[PDB]
């Protein structure tokens, strides 16, 4: 029973920090976001109670974590593969779509965004083969993106980082949209903890 | 020293058992395969020193392990997701492609086999919902993939287990097919340990 008390608190702490992480992300305060993320990670090895209540929370956190790290290509969230953070972000996106019961129509516009930045970023980075790889595996597919497949494709062989697509690409702009997207499938709140701090910072 | 010594035996042991694993799979002795698989898995926690030396055979072992369990849809190989063994095999196929630096032309034919098998097994097990998901997500595109995809959807919408595409698909046939694809990408050299067991016993 001493155990089920810890469980209850750990749940409050996770929810509270998840709340502050979005806040930090929202304010483009990415260092704080990262310190809070690590706290939540250290929190996951502990008894959380029942996983119906933080799994949506947890998935969005995963997506954001991978996105906030997308510019570091040597960083990996995949255990088995050499995946760029944005490739791993796509996979999370997929779990979110499956677990949040959303439709392809609702999700394709964001994931599309993710595919784009994953390639551009490889490109903005002189990593031209990965760029090709990601494009041929994720974008070398749909309809309304051919024009883009073909432009990103040529930008690659010519190494045209001088291209309007590349130069006007803004990751900060990218990040914020992804957060806006992920937020619209999550409640809003005040975590018991934050609510009790005010009830006392009284 | 005494430590660099275990690494060398761990390397020999890993390689020797991978061969016995292929031999058992080749002979359709999947229980033996699973048993050798667990031995190899237990071995991975130990020092192997030279990663790049076991990396290829390990990726092939991974694919084979997910293919061998392809009919146990309640079995999963992802910490993160709700993936059937075959969906996981696919991901391994992608890693194999990258780390073996294989071309799409070579990988795609076998990847279509795994998608076909992943959809059909779901169908045979009557998980028409998981099937459509895998179908929609994987053969979602269009070339030749145009007739089998349609048939499958039609078979699904109709819960038609009696259709010929279902009735004439044999997991055994599929398994041996994937072993042959994977074998043709390995240097099939005799394990040190086996050479010695030969000097040693004769």
């Amino acid at each position: 029973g001493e155990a089920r008390l810890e469980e209850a608190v750990n749940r409050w702490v996770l929810k509270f920090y998840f709340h502050e992480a979005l806040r930090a992300f929202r304010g483009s305060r990415y260092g704080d976001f990262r310190q809070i993320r690590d706290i939540m990670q250290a929190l996951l090895v502990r008894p959380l109670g029942k996983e119906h209540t933080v799994s949506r929370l947890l998935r969005v956190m995963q997506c954001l974590s991978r996105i906030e790290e997308g510019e570091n290509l040597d960083c990996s969230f995949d255990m088995e593969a050499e995946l760029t953070p944005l490739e791993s972000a796509i996979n999370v996106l997929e779990m979110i779509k499956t677990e949040f019961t959303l439709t392809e129509a609702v999700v394709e516009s964001s994931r599309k965004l993710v595919k784009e930045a994953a390639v551009i970023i490889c490109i903005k980075n002189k990593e031209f083969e990965k760029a090709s790889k990601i494009l041929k595996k994720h974008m070398s597919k749909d309809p309304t993106t051919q024009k883009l497949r073909n432009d990103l494709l040529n930008i690659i062989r010519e190494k045209n980082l001088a291209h309007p697509v590349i130069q006007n690409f803004s990751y900060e702009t990218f990040q914020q949209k992804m957060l806006r997207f992920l937020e619209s499938h999550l409640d809003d709140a005040e975590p018991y903890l934050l609510t009790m701090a005010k009830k006392a910072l009284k | 020293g005494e430590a660099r010594l275990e690494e060398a035996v761990n390397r020999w042991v890993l390689k020797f058992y991978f061969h016995e694993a292929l031999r058992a799979f080749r002979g359709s002795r999947y229980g033996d395969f699973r048993q050798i698989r667990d031995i190899m898995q237990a071995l991975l926690v130990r020092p192997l020193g030279k990663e790049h030396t076991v990396s290829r055979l390990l990726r092939v072992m991974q694919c084979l392990s997910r293919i061998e369990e392809g009919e146990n849809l309640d079995c999963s190989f992802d910490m993160e997701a709700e993936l059937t063994p075959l969906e996981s095999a696919i991901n391994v196929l992608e890693m194999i492609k990258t780390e073996f630096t294989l071309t799409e032309a070579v990988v795609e034919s076998s990847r279509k086999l795994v998608k076909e098998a992943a959809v059909i097994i779901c169908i045979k097990n009557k998980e028409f919902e998981k099937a459509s998901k895998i179908l929609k997500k994987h053969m979602s595109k269009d070339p030749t993939t145009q007739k089998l995809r349609n048939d499958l959807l039609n078979i699904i919408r109709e819960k038609n287990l009696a259709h010929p595409v279902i009735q004439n698909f044999s997991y055994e046939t599929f398994q041996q097919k994937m072993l042959r694809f994977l074998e043709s990408h390995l240097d099939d050299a005799e394990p040190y340990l086996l050479t010695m067991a030969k000097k040693a016993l004769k």
């Binding site: 993320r37 990670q41 996983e51 995963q62 790290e69 040597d74 990996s76 969230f77 255990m79 | 993160e80």
Partner: peptide, 12 residues
């Protein structure tokens, strides 16, 4: 596996 299943930090 909450830590591995909902992994938030880079393996790396």
């Amino acid at each position: 596996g909450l830590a591995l299943k909902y992994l938030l930090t880079p393996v790396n």
